[PDB]
Amino acid sequence: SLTRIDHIGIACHDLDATVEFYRATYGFEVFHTEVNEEQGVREAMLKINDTSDGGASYLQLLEPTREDSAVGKWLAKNGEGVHHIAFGTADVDADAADIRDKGVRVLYDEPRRGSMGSRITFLHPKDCHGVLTELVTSAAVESP
Amino acid sequence: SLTRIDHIGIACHDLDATVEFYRATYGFEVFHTEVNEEQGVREAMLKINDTSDGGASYLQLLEPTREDSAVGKWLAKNGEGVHHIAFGTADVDADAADIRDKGVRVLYDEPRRGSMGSRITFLHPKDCHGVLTELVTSAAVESP
Ligand SMILES: C[C@@H](C(=O)O)C(=O)SCCNC(=O)CCNC(=O)[C@H](O)C(C)(C)COP(=O)(O)OP(=O)(O)OC[C@H]1O[C@@H](n2cnc3c(N)ncnc32)[C@H](O)[C@@H]1OP(=O)(O)O
Ligand SMILES: C[C@@H](C(=O)O)C(=O)SCCNC(=O)CCNC(=O)[C@H](O)C(C)(C)COP(=O)(O)OP(=O)(O)OC[C@H]1O[C@@H](n2cnc3c(N)ncnc32)[C@H](O)[C@@H]1OP(=O)(O)O
Ligand SMILES: [N+]
Ligand SMILES: [N+]
């Protein structure tokens, strides 16, 4: 089952400028940064709070590494803003299979690598009332 | 200070259909429903988790009551999807004054009523890298 909001994915043109905006305005600090070449993003995770399922909630800021990428295409069409939402689960494989069985498009056969070694999948936004929806299992098994 | 993600505001054409989508797909149940005539929305809050600051994180689904409203205009332009993000604080007045002093546009002089008697304000999306950003203090003082 989906037991938390894991993160809000926010697309931006300049990761370093947008990271600084969040730090200066709200005091949010960088929890982690990494590049995901498969996904075509440079990302920064900003931890906002811990959650009742033993996990955490983050802002995931995303700069495209290339124009021909999910985020590069989205930014070109829509400008900076919220790109996706992500829910956490202890068993992304099982929850993705259950959602596939409801006729919602699951974009990956098998979960792929996300931030901090997590295992991720996505649901198609046109099946989710316009919201690109990620399902995430953290690499570190967390304690409710 | 901003101590949690309070909610994700998600605009939809049909609140009851979108509520049912979230229930059927993810098992999320309705925590509360209300109409905010000033804001021009019918809303449903779906609680996803509790947070380390004593608060909670919700999906806030929003149907416009009228076309001439923030959400009615947004839906007409963009279709269904994520409308805003909201951060929680124990002192919305103080945090809004600090952010005003950074040159980010605060849309209200004084916080206004939000869901479940909360006190709310908004930051202009063009000052927040494209994200309409809400600040929320819950009506019930919560215990970290
Ligand atoms: C690394 C990981 C982590 O946790 O670290 C991440 O988050 S990586 C984050 C970046 N990676 C991802 O997003 C991977 C998952 N996304 C994708 O595979 C793609 O972006 C799709 C969702 C398949 C969309 O690709 P597609 O080729 O269809 O592009 P498109 O422009 O033709 O989009 C088709 C329709 O989907 C809509 N659409 C596209 N992206 C959307 C988004 N982010 N939110 C909502 N709607 C979206 C378009 O407006 C269009 O609607 P109309 O019919 O109205 O024109
Ligand atoms: C009840 C409470 C609760 O907690 O219960 C809620 O959440 S109530 C939720 C509903 N209420 C609210 O949202 C109230 C706060 N929002 C507002 O006052 C408004 O929507 C504004 C943010 C002032 C935008 O109004 P405005 O008159 O400027 O409309 P507009 O279409 O001309 O927008 C001007 C520029 O802002 C952009 N823009 C507009 N709405 C946006 C949004 N939700 N996210 C990101 N960007 C947004 C437009 O694309 C445009 O960019 P371009 O320059 O690129 O064209
Ligand atoms: N993500
Ligand atoms: N909201």
Side-chain angles (χ1 to χ4, degrees), chain A residues 70-131:
Chain A
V71 175
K73 278 186 52 155
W74 195 84
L75 273 174
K77 198 263 202 74
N78 297 285
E80 303 192 304
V82 177
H83 177 259
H84 66 264
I85 74 173
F87 296 110
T89 166
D91 191 350
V92 57
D93 302 87
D95 286 331
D98 286 351
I99 290 165
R100 167 200 74 200
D101 288 349
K102 299 177 198 293
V104 171
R105 284 170 287 176
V106 178
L107 303 190
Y108 303 150
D109 290 292
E110 295 300 338
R112 296 195 183 169
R113 179 165 59 86
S115 327
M116 287 181 291
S118 60
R119 283 177 79 254
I120 68 171
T121 195
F122 291 92
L123 311 179
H124 196 293
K126 294 297 191 178
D127 297 343
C128 299
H129 291 281
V131 177

Side-chain angles (χ1 to χ4, degrees), chain A residues 11-12 39-41 62-64 66 69-76 83:
Chain A
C12 62
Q39 293 295 347
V41 292
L62 303 162
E63 191 186 324
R66 64 177 173 265
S69 65
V71 175
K73 278 186 52 155
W74 195 84
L75 273 174
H83 177 259

Side-chain angles (χ1 to χ4, degrees), chain B residues 33-44:
Chain B
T33 61
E34 71 187 298
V35 169
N36 187 312
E37 272 304 334
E38 176 177 48
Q39 293 295 347
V41 292
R42 190 161 146 245
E43 63 175 77

